[PDB]
Amino acid sequence: GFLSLDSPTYVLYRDRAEWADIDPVPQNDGPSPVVQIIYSEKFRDVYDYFRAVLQRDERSERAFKLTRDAIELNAANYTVWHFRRVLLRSLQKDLQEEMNYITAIIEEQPKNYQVWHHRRVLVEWLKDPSQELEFIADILNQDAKNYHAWQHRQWVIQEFRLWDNELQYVDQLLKEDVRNNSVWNQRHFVISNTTGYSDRAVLEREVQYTLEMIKLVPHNESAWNYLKGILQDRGLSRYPNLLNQLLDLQPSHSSPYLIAFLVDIYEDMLENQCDNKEDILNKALELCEILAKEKDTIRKEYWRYIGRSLQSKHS
Amino acid sequence: LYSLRPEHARERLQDDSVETVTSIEQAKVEEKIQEVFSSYKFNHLVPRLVLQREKHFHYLKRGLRQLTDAYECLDASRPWLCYWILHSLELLDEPIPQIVATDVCQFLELCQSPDGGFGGGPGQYPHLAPTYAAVNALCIIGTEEAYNVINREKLLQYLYSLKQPDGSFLMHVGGEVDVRSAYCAASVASLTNIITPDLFEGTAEWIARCQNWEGGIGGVPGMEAHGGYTFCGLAALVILKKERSLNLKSLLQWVTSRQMRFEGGFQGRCNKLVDGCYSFWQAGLLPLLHRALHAQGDPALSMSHWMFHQQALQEYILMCCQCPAGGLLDKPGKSRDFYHTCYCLSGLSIAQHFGSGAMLHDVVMGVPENVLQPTHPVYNIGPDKVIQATTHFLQKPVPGF
Ligand SMILES: CC(C)=CCC/C(C)=C/CC/C(C)=C/CC/C(C)=C/COP(=O)(O)OP(=O)(O)O
Ligand SMILES: [Zn+2]
């Protein structure tokens, strides 16, 4: 019998008969309280009673129902969440009903840490990941960048080995918003944990896919960071055609990302004994000044450092 | 004012005529920020960048004693409210009466668990976040009374109870793992001098696995690079003297790319919105990377500035992140809170003060009364407090068990 904390007929615990035996334990804030919260009547009521059942380690069905109210009053109280998991095991509660519960609270507080960790503990206990990818997709449908949702998704996929359809899901979300960096991250997570980027066809597929995206939305930093990320491995200079291919978007799709990418390719050519070293150095130093002075001034101190550093190296 | 220059309008978002939730939300932000920048011109006054010290101080001195039921959501984060406030007053150069100080000490004693570490309130199980906040708070107070609150033998035991075989640490028993725990532990263990030879074994390696394709660091391996996690990961490595376990260059490129060309403040992760608290988590990384690269004997490092735009950040904070009523915030339109007051102020201080050995170069935008007390980039408490706390605890030996 869950009398909702929001129920118009909700009554304070101290006014409840089935609780009349127990004496509520108030909070010990000391004689000279600091950062002391002037709790509401309800909050203060539920917690004084929570303290009482916890202090006597009373593992009852009534205590279990109470933690729910204390969680709803403050979902970040990890001590309450802990005692709740204690009661889930002692009382041998139906963990599937608890999944329904945690599904509801997460929808309400998708950015709370405790709610997600609890769901994880439930999935571990039941060794059942069947509802996970779908539940998470519903959270990401509301906020496609929820960090906890993405973390949970990554944990479920790696733990239960659910890799088969993730690249497709990633393609789906990239269509919705090609600027969703969380999705570019998921793309790399899936690939690196399945085929890897050493497979030349995959690498080629990924570099071409990314280049088409850069063509469509040239100022999307994610696509640029992903391009640099997957090639940076072997070294950007290892790919001779790339420089030319980017130098071609120089007039058309030319953002300060293309410029910065060119200095990156240059930095690596210099480090890898490239031909035309003096020539290459000047180009890279020219771009560092255009960036520092004109195209990307917010990063002036960074680009100057790159300038200095580059001279100091290949002078 | 960089933000007010005419050519600055050129820094507005270019959506390539392809709108997505991302470009649309950013645009809304830029539009709101632009209105703030131009308010002066539209009201024909001379821009006067002033840090409302007194407004900020009434808000703080008051929250330090009592709060409305609006703060019920922080009932499990009380040592945080102490740290946030005491640190904000510290940056503002406001003193702690010996009476308030002793009271804070007594409260934190109630939060301290008999098994080491601190809970988020009297009688709450210990957790690493409030443990970090409690120890930091006690070091800001810096009295022998404060130092003595911390039960060092139980704290070491506690840290060991969270240590994992792969090198990570849980946030609390039966809890989650992420880069924050490594930092909370390395911060409290180092400040209190309880670091045993094997305590952080493999921790540097675990944090290194959190660095991804972006250059930044995620909460756990595989996760998107984030500013809060990246600060925790790098700062923890600096504490352990293993910064070299990271690709410092890709990290330097990632963090500097997080400063918003238009707003001037920092975003938490690529393609997300600017946020005032990141004035510290992201900008705080530059002094750390400076120290590290310089430790590697980098000859190209500046001798007067951090590798981010100090002027633009100070302008975003001063024009966009202050609540007239006192307190700082995420961005225009957001509500003030003690978290943002602590971090906006912390990020301002980092932005004003530069240092590299013998070099010292301030940059105080607006009225010179704007200059705040300096903050240590690793611990985020006054540098003096760090030296003072570590020297004190070094008088004590590392608990042997
Ligand atoms: C505890 C200590 C010492 C430091 C904490 C430092 C921080 C801020 C860590 C960040 C924690 C984090 C990234 C959690 C993931 C879940 C989450 C809510 C991320 C932020 O999401 P948004 O609220 O959308 O914010 P952003 O878009 O700015 O990332
Ligand atoms: Zn923030």
PDB file of N, CA, C and O and ligand atoms in Angstrom, chain B residues 275 277 330 339-340, ligand 2:
ATOM      1  N   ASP B 275      29.505  26.877 -19.786  1.00  0.00           N
ATOM      2  CA  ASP B 275      28.994  26.810 -18.422  1.00  0.00           C
ATOM      3  C   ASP B 275      30.045  27.408 -17.512  1.00  0.00           C
ATOM      4  O   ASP B 275      31.211  27.033 -17.556  1.00  0.00           O
ATOM      5  N   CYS B 277      30.879  26.939 -14.347  1.00  0.00           N
ATOM      6  CA  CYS B 277      31.678  26.108 -13.439  1.00  0.00           C
ATOM      7  C   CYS B 277      32.907  25.563 -14.129  1.00  0.00           C
ATOM      8  O   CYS B 277      33.901  25.257 -13.472  1.00  0.00           O
ATOM      9  N   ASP B 330      25.853  29.386 -13.718  1.00  0.00           N
ATOM     10  CA  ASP B 330      26.133  28.673 -14.946  1.00  0.00           C
ATOM     11  C   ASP B 330      26.219  29.650 -16.119  1.00  0.00           C
ATOM     12  O   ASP B 330      27.275  29.846 -16.694  1.00  0.00           O
ATOM     13  N   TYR B 339      27.719  26.084  -5.539  1.00  0.00           N
ATOM     14  CA  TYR B 339      28.625  25.318  -6.388  1.00  0.00           C
ATOM     15  C   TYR B 339      29.245  26.260  -7.415  1.00  0.00           C
ATOM     16  O   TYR B 339      30.468  26.310  -7.581  1.00  0.00           O
ATOM     17  N   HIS B 340      28.378  26.978  -8.125  1.00  0.00           N
ATOM     18  CA  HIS B 340      28.793  27.932  -9.140  1.00  0.00           C
ATOM     19  C   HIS B 340      29.533  29.133  -8.576  1.00  0.00           C
ATOM     20  O   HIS B 340      30.418  29.671  -9.240  1.00  0.00           O
TER      21      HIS B 340
HETATM   22 ZN    ZN C   2      28.203  24.314 -14.223  1.00  0.00          ZN
END
